[PDB]
Each structure stands twice: as structure tokens, then as C-alpha cells.
Structure 1
Amino acid sequence: ELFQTADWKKEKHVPVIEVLRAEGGVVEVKVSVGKEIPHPNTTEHHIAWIELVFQPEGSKFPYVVGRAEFAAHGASVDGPNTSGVYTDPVAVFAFKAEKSGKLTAFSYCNIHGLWMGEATLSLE
């Protein structure tokens, strides 16, 4: 597959999924690349986006919950890595859900290809 997987404790590229809240219909999910091991963020090398998909139990098809783009990577008129502005590849997705299901995150490095990770959403 194009979507690489790995242990996130060992591999900086794996998008890590964290369920911050899941109760009373409302959910809070944080996705982060480089959680254990930081990934570089330079004009030449950076994580560009994270996309979160959720498939409720009982639903034949998955739904994209959202997508986060990280657009600043130090680039300026003075040259690469000079602007002082760097977007950290961490996104928080807030959404309503009526029952439990599966989460999948997709992420992209401009040089190291595509990555995915999976997690259970246990709704209360």
C-alpha cells in the first residue's frame, strides 16, 4: 500500500490518534505527527497535512471528519528557513457522533510519502 504504518514510539511519521473526549454525543480527537519523536519542519522537509476519517458502527461507508493543512515552513523573501513561522503538524477535530466506531488518520510528508494510523472510538 501507499500508506505506510509503523510503531509511533519508533517512527516519527506515524499520525498518532488521541481521544480527548467521547460522551454525550460530542467527541474531541487530537491527531499528531512526531508525538514521541519530533519530525523536522524546514522549507525542504515537512509534514503537509493530516486527514481524519470516522466510520460509525452500523454504517456501511466511512466519513471524512476533516482535514488540517500545515502551510508555514520558514519560507520567506530572505530565503528558506528565515521567516520564523513554522506550523506544527497537530490537529484537533471536534465533532458530534451518535455511536461508536473506527477512526483512521492519514498523513503526508513532502519527501517520505503517505502514512496512516488507526484507533477505536468508544462513545459514552
Structure 2
Amino acid sequence: ELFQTADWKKQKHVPVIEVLRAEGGVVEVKVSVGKEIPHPNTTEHHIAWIELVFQPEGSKFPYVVGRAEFAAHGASVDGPNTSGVYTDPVAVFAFKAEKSGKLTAFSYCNIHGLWMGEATLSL
């Protein structure tokens, strides 16, 4: 499987989903990589993006809610790891949802392949 899954307590690359809030029709879901025990952010090694998917209970198909790209990793004309701008693999998605469902998160490490995390959304 292209999408690797691991315990997030013991494994660095699993994208972790946290349902923070559910206000006025609007859910806010936090997704992060390297939550308890941190992942590197270097020119050579970094998390590039996270994509969040939501499949509502009555739906035949899942929907992509969004995608967060982490594009800065210290590269500059003065050489790798010199720009001082490093983007964290952490994202917050605000979306309107009416019913409950399964949230799926995908993440990509530039040297460690593709990863997946899951959680349930109760409305």
C-alpha cells in the first residue's frame, strides 16, 4: 500500500486528525504531522502537503475538503537551510457539514512516501 499507516504515538509520519469545534454549521478540523514526536523540516527532508477528505454518512462518494501545501524549507541562494523560513506540517480546515462521517487525511514526506490517517466526525 502506497498509503502507510502506523500508530501515531510511536510513528512520525502519520497525519493526526483532531476535531476542534462545531459552531453554527462550521466544523474545524486540525490535521498535523509529527504531533507527539516531531518530524524534520529541512531542505533535504520535509513534509510537503496534507490533504483532508470527508465522506458524510449518506454519501456514495467522499469529498475533498481541502489541501494544505507546505512550500518553504530553508532553501536560499546562500545554500540549503539558510533562508530561515520553515513551514510546519500543520493545517486547519473550516468547513460546513450537516451530517456525521469519516474524515481521511493524507500526507506526503519527500523521502518517506505517502501516509494516511482516519477519524470520525459526529454531528
1:19 equivalent in structure 2:
19
Structure 2: distance between partners of 1:89 and 1:82 = 19
Q: Residues 22 and 121 of structure 1 are in contact (CA less than 8 Å); yes or no, is this contact kept in structure 2? A: no
Compute the displacement of 1:106 (Å). 0.2
Where does structure 2 lack aligned partners over 5 or more consecutive residues? none
Q: Cα deviations across residues 4-58 of structure 1 (Å, max 9, x unaligned)?
A: 0000010010000000012442100000000011000000000000000000001
TM-score by length of 2: 0.98
Structure 2: distance between partners of 1:87 and 1:121 = 27
1:102 equivalent in structure 2:
102
Where does structure 1 lack aligned partners over 5 or more consecutive residues? none
TM-score by length of 1: 0.97
Structure 2: distance between partners of 1:23 and 1:119 = 19
Structure 2: distance between partners of 1:59 and 1:23 = 22
For structure 1, which segment, 21-30 or 40-49, has the greater mean C-alpha deviation from structure 2 after superposition?
21-30
For structure 1, which segment, 22-31 or 68-77, has the greater mean C-alpha deviation from structure 2 after superposition?
22-31
Structure 2: distance between partners of 1:118 and 1:22 = 18
| Runs of 4+ residues over 6 Å off in structure 1 | none
Q: Cα deviations across residues 38-97 of structure 1 (Å, max 9, x unaligned)?
A: 000000000000000000001000000000000000000000000010000000000000
1:29 equivalent in structure 2:
29
Number of matched pairs: 123
| Identical pairs, percent | 99
